[PDB]
Symmetry: C3
Subunit: 228 residues, 3 copies
């Protein structure tokens, strides 16, 4: 069939595994069969490695995400990222990925192609964040989240000069979630920068976009300072 259904099938299999309905061998067999039905041989080999017991579910998910990045499948990428962020107990990251998926789905139905590369760099940053979390190395997580906040700042700067309004709300929600994450990680300056960007986006959405440029430059200067 089409690549959209394939992602739905794989996602349903992974949710069945996560909820406890099926086990690892059943999940491996089902996902390998699904991938083989669509002709994806590399993904089938990666799942075969799980079927042999060499790797675990999280490692298989990481390798599947890398392979899908090489191939260029988007819905499968979002499904795999949500599964990765659900295997690790982080509901906030899953919420961020869900909002980004909604943004991507809104973007693909129109001619906006400049945002797609953004939405993609941010997916790479999210993948690096997940990898760093899996390594239990908390120092790189903050820098990667700072890069994510900078990317969202660039996207909101692009969006303000246009007439979009739902994009502003979604970026505000994402930035609020990241600020909460920063607060839960024992950091205050990066959380303050994220809340500054969120406040600037809120001001721009409200109608007073003249006050937003000073907030934007202050926030970007602070973010650049804190990364180094």
């Amino acid at each position: 069939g089409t690549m959209e259904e394939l992602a739905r099938r794989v996602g349903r299999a992974i949710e069945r595994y996560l909820n406890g309905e099926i086990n690892e061998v059943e999940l491996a067999l089902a996902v390998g069969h699904i991938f083989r039905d669509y002709g994806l041989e590399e993904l089938h080999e990666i799942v075969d490695r799980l079927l042999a017991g060499e790797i675990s579910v999280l490692e298989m998910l990481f390798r599947l995400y890398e392979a899908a990045v090489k191939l260029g499948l988007d819905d499968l990428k979002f499904v795999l990222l949500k599964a990765i962020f659900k295997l690790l107990n982080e509901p906030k990251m899953v919420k961020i990925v869900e909002i980004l998926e909604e943004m991507y789905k809104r973007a693909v139905k129109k001619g906006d192609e400049e945002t797609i590369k953004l939405l993609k760099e941010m997916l790479e940053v999210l993948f690096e964040i997940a990898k760093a979390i899996a390594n239990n190395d908390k120092e790189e997580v903050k820098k990667l989240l700072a890069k994510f906040v900078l990317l969202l700042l660039e996207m909101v700067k692009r969006a303000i000069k246009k007439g979009d309004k739902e994009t502003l709300k979604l970026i505000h929600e994402i930035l609020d979630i990241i600020a909460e994450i920063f607060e839960e990680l024992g950091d205050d300056e990066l959380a303050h920068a994220a809340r500054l960007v969120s406040k600037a986006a809120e001001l721009a959405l409200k109608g007073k976009k003249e006050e937003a440029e000073k907030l934007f430059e202050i926030a970007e200067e602070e973010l650049k300072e804190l990364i180094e």
Copy 2:
């Protein structure tokens, strides 16, 4: 292999599922593999739908039966009908299907081809009965059972002019089962018509086939009157 081996394998898998030995994912994987081994692609997609959790076992069985009717596989049809009538708690309908299957196996080893279309029509009627039962609509069940009784009346009329004797006993047993079904459904007139046909068949089998016809047209007018 041959179409007879496939039916036995699928039936065995379904009994393993029904007895509680295997679960739904294992059953889906096994049955899809069996169908793929024999080159039946459409049945494989139908089972794939179950593997994704879109449909249940009963809906999958119904779709498999429809696909096998389109293809023309008989033993698979009988296996699927028995499974359908076993998932719904109706041993009597399973007994009717078993007797029909024995009749079909007896007929195929000889040159009798006229009984084949009648058995196919009765299989269609039984499929509609199962569908109506799944819909919990009790009004159409009685009408469909009346049509089934009329078809058995036609077959017994055909068989009496011939020398068949086991067919007479099997039709008598089937008619008794339908009479019990009608009695358990809170109906008395249709049960009386079914018992009238059974009595006519028994009289013809005994040797007094002169008295059978009066009963025969009496039962047929009663059945025609009760359908409308």
Copy 3:
């Protein structure tokens, strides 16, 4: 992939089944998929017979071993023999198979091709021993073990004329295990012959190979006498 990784994958699947991690349907599906991935169709049909419930795991292992003997896969043969001797509660035979596979692995990395045929004959003898045990027929087990001891005697006679030293230790350990097996089987003469051969091997390894030959012919005539 290569035939070495296939044996590892199959052995891992069977180990998972034996340890209780997976059940018979999961093992059947996994092993059939593994054999299908490498293009081994006959092994796939043999596993299919297990998927349908016609045969059990032990019978499936026996048929797979016979088919691999016909095909000429050695690592798969060792894996299947180990699984067979693990399903039957016999750790000593598993130890014998492990030592034999170590000897085979040592031999295949050099130019020694004469030991390969003798190891093949001993593998046939061990397969016959497993078959006889599965039949609960104890009298043939002793004669087959006598033939195995004679084959080990031939190998030790060949190896003494060469400079091999680890081979002598391995045959000594194997002969000690067979002697323990004979003692546990309520036999003393065959156990005495096995211990005689082991003592001759130990004497030859120590450096006094002049006294080994007398023990050698004594043990071989005793073994020939006891078989008849």
